[PDB]
Amino acid sequence: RPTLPIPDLLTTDARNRIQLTIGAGQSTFGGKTATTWGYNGNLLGPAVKLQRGKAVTVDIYNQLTEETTLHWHGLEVPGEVDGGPQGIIPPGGKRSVTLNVDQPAATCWFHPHQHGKTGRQVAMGLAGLVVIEDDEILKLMLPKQWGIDDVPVIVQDKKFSADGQIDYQLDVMTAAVGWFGDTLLTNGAIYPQHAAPRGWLRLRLLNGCNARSLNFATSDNRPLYVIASDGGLLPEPVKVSELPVLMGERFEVLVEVNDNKPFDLVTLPVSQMGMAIAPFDKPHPVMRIQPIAISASGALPDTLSSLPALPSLEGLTVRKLQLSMDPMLDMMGMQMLMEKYGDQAMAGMDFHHANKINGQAFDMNKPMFAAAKGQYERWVISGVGDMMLHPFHIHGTQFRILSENGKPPAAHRAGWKDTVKVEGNVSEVLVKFNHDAPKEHAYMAHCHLLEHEDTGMMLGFTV
Template sequence: MAGQDFDFCVSRRLFLAGSASAALMAGISPRLALASDRPALPIPAEMRADPAGTIKLSAQASTMNFLPGVATPTYGINGPYLGPALRVRRGDTVNMDVRNTLAEPVTMHWHGLEIPGDDDGGPAEAIAPGATWKPSLTIDQPAATCWFHPHYYPSTAELVLKGLAGLFIIEDDDTDRLPLPSTWGVDDIPIIIQDRRFNPDGSFFHRFNLAAVTVGYVGDTVLVNGAINPVASTAKGWLRLRLLNGSNARSYQLAFSDDRPFYVIASDGGLLAQPVRMNSLPLHAGERYEILVDARDGSAFDLVTSPVMQMAMNLPPFDQTLPVMTFSPDGAETEGTMPDALATLPPLSSSQDLQTQDLKFGMNLDAEGMGLFMKAGLPKMRAGGSTDPEIAKAVEQVILEGPDLTQEAQLSANNINGVSFALNKVNFDLPIDTDLRMVFSEGTDKMLHPVHVHGCQYRVVTVNGDPAPEYMQGWKDTAAISQGGTVEVQVRFKHPATAEKPYMAHCHILEHEDSGMMAAFTVS
């Protein structure tokens, strides 16, 4: 908060020390054993539809002890922070019952699901305090690790920051036939990575100032499934990790501390054609990847993140390789393994005459606004190198004490195709059941924007003019552009979206989304 003395290293010390008092979430199954004084990795409880085909969710206020002896005000879904892992099958029709017990409106967006605009949970589907929303979701897409979170405009960032998010897992017969690790919390491990920053009183820091609408949320503490520096006691064998970047803005460059290789088997919308061997994986806000890692030797190892080329995101402790969590494969050996082939993906359209929708992401900041960051020395902060302490302090001061924006200034700070988002305004229309080309590009600001499109799963064709890397060649709903680059995708919308309940295309840096970097579109 402005005028308060923040300990620049406090969260780093807390991260490295861990917290024995980090509470397990309600609805979280404590299956993994506690190691030393560090918390066990909380595992979200699996939740399926009841015999009537209904899943009941409740957004509620609570508190959590992330830091020793300090209660942090939180929001959660069926518990104090985050929510259950919903499980559905392809072919199901699931009746959702979403109750809002908070004192402010919310929505609930089913991120990654191919469903009509009426059920998508975008900004037009507000759930008032005390009200219940009951969409019916017909699941007709491949097995995938999706997620759900609010999409209320213009407070999505604040709602997600406080804890409203959860996994939405789709199953199908084709994936069931593969010998993949499948025991929840044992060799099939959900990993929701978020960064947070705490005020001195333990509450989450968040301000809509110039820093927020420019670079997004800059945390200094990593949470995994709501715990700081947890330990996962797992099976000894192949592990399937379901990675979700649930952060408001931060990207991660993930690897393992012993440099062991891993294999990407699925992206946002489902399985790849075959496993892709990697040693390091970029994970942007809103993205999901499933990876397999060989833990048959039984030795413990850390999941780590390295500095990234994203403005302001390599402040300490992210100025060096940082441990995120530890895996201790000390359980019984399991039978899950890595198949040679995974899924059959349809070929991309070879037509050069596809209708094209361009989306150019830009900022409306004037020279004076950008000057604050130039003076703070952000251009000198380079990923992977040491950060000048004076520059870091200057940047930290802008983040913590930069002037708050009026809501009018916030809502017009960013844009797509030169137009800031406005409720009840449709920006473009697309045809249904037609192969389309979409091109995401970035203006002259050289910023990073993970682009999410509702109501679809797309295929990435090129990144900065080159063919998409192998690990991105499956089904995607979020892909990042940066440094003036472009991403070209092919997409086909299977369902309609009306002007009353349109789909959204937006940057998944939530502070960008809440400050105008979003476009509404119809499909008919």
Template sequence: MKRRTFLKRSLAALALAGAGSSGLSLLGKSGFATQAIAGDFSKPLPIPPLLENLDTSGKSALFAMNVQRGNVNFFPDKTTSTLGYNGNFLGPTIRVRNGQRFQIKVNNTLPQVTTLHWHGLHVPARWDGGPRQPIPAGTTWNPDFVINQEAATLWYHPHAMGLTGEQVYHGLAGLFLIEDEVSDNLDIPKNYGVDDIPLVIQDRRFFADGQFAYVQNMHDVMNGVIGNYILVNGTREPTLTVPKGQVRLRLLNGSNSSIYRIGFDDKRNFHVIASDGGFLERPVPMNNIRLSAGERAEILVDFSGESAFALISLLVEQMGSRTFEAMRIAVKGTAEVTALVQSLRKTEKIPEGEASVHRSFIMETMSMGRGRMGMGMMGRRLTINGKKMDINRIDEQVKIGSTEIWEITNRSAMMMSMPHSMHLHDVQFQILSRNGRLPALHEQGRKDTVLIMPGETVRIISRFHDYTGVYMYHCHLLEHEDDGMMGQFEVVT
């Protein structure tokens, strides 16, 4: 009987989704495979394995990883060609500690160049893994540096010039967790894969033969490649079984360009405990959270009141239109943590007065003219401050040790309003304001990626400490990035 209630709730959620602008069309775009009407949800949610530390003493972090080709059966009768780290699709979770020496041997077995970028990591420029650190086909790359950052849920993915979107889409992404004394000592769930669950959420579309439909026509470049299937940890329609009590979900929007609103079918409250760069000061109650491509959030969900047969759906609404039942959650057994933690970590707010330099950035979607439709679309351009990425040009110079305020505006002309998602390498920043107002509580912690809707202006403040060298700032909608919506800042002495 519980099951019937669940089905009703689930259908209600789908009907609600149908009220969106695109409606609940279960027919895919022509040429693309279509979403199944009734989900399967028989597969258990796979948990990415923790990457084995080759330093058995655990003193330092010593890892090896292959970038390789693979095959996955996303549909029972069809095989999809994929890419993965040490496997067919996605990669293992890398877990390190603040202060630990980190060494990894990245072996590129692909027939094309790749890179490995540590998204959100405060890292020496030469080991950043951006477009300036290519790993040519058949070669290895050997970063070696010390983790210099508080506990956080970061991730890694390729970042080679013009290839990021395609390589991520085919499966190159994984989580990168930093732990420290604070995360050790907080009374929060921390048993990886049991009550501390990583959720890499992505959408994909497929050709009828089962291959990923990663085609980049002009429409896809402008709007991003948006899929009609949701994958969680690389799996369609999985079920996660959690213990009764507090469960921590580490959410990553690992999609190429989608903006997700994530919540539950029964609209239950949860508590956000961490943003991109680590813990908030205290848990923030919400019942849905918006994450743009590249953003993360850690949430605590209380499953202590469920009956033994409860099933809860994790819903993902895509771009304000379609809602997908992304995953089901079954409750079984008893959790170690049953009470909600009250405070997490004291975080110093960087005072505005500390900033000595102010810069402004205009993220722009502009038309090069020749009519609004048809051929006119060919002339659309995505730029930052009127420029496209040029690896031989340094756009901004930042003095080491300085604090800066960056004002970022999404200026989109009528009929071409695109959201953008600004990501800075090297630093974790704080959001001072969104359209002149304080950001929501869950956006007041450390961030490395911020969604900027059409017409919005976001002001961020950051300290540029420790490392000199060249880093990227770019739109994290990967089709925008690959089209050149990216610039370089150099931290100088």
């Protein structure tokens, strides 16, 4: 097996700058070459390393021949640097942003957010990581050797055409159920191996799929200890036997590594339209972990961090967000899915503006509302009326889930999140915005099933 590719951990240079170049190159998948896009490379991207309270400048060079934007998913930053659909970087051009991180240590990530083209640009290869550090997390003595016992694991599916090229399409079927494929990539590689020292292995998991939800487990049923969610550390580790991860979500886990016993990280079949078609009808290997005997000091602390109590709900502004899909899209998309793949596609169960929030497909010129600044609000997001999975993402914030699709959140999902599951039921989140976002650079709130976002299921809001 190939070794697990390790993204460069990229810090500021002598001028306090970080350079990202967006460009097209070539990658090889199963011995077939494909045109791919990457940040500072042919595919995916580096891990940008930030320190809480230390402002840096990021220079972003777009060397594609089309427009793109660079969104920092999970970062609590002003709208002006948020890199949403309004943050256009011309082909051949450059945009610079100041990032002054004012949030706890976390694994965030970045990716394009081009209006109606986000699914395609991510599918082509564009994604990178953000590693935020603070004073607190370094005192913990977690596994911290980047690429050795602290490793990023970006998991993505793709589909390829016979000629080996990435086979992306935004059509009525994918607008309904998402773009998904039959080939699983792990930091861009197919079923790589990672050699990890005996002791604790820290995995920073990112579901970077367009539309496929994942569910991580180990091949020999050793548990995963969740230590962080989207927005950082949990108050204490949460032991799980399997770990569902929605599109765009991150979790950090520790897993035990003992000699003479390699094991796989796998993903388990999920109950999501279309996502259990072979080879995903059975547990699917993600990567092989090979124990080695080199230095490792990491530990699993009893206590990780301190999370504030939920604020009182009384008096809080309530914002209602009704997600919906045009009945025609729902009908025709599910029909095409069924026709193409048959019964297995439901195992466990103008389209360009057919997906909507509050009866409106995304209008970049009209933010739906102005949220308060520095005040908690309660946002209620409903997927009642269709059966699709909507990982709902809100820019500019790390929030607390109050209720997730009809139940209180699981322990490992009760900390800082920027995504919440909405699937045929209703979710509630407690959100606060610490930074400005004017109409010209509004925040987005949207489904992170990228084909839904690209066909309308997004709103803008100001702070």
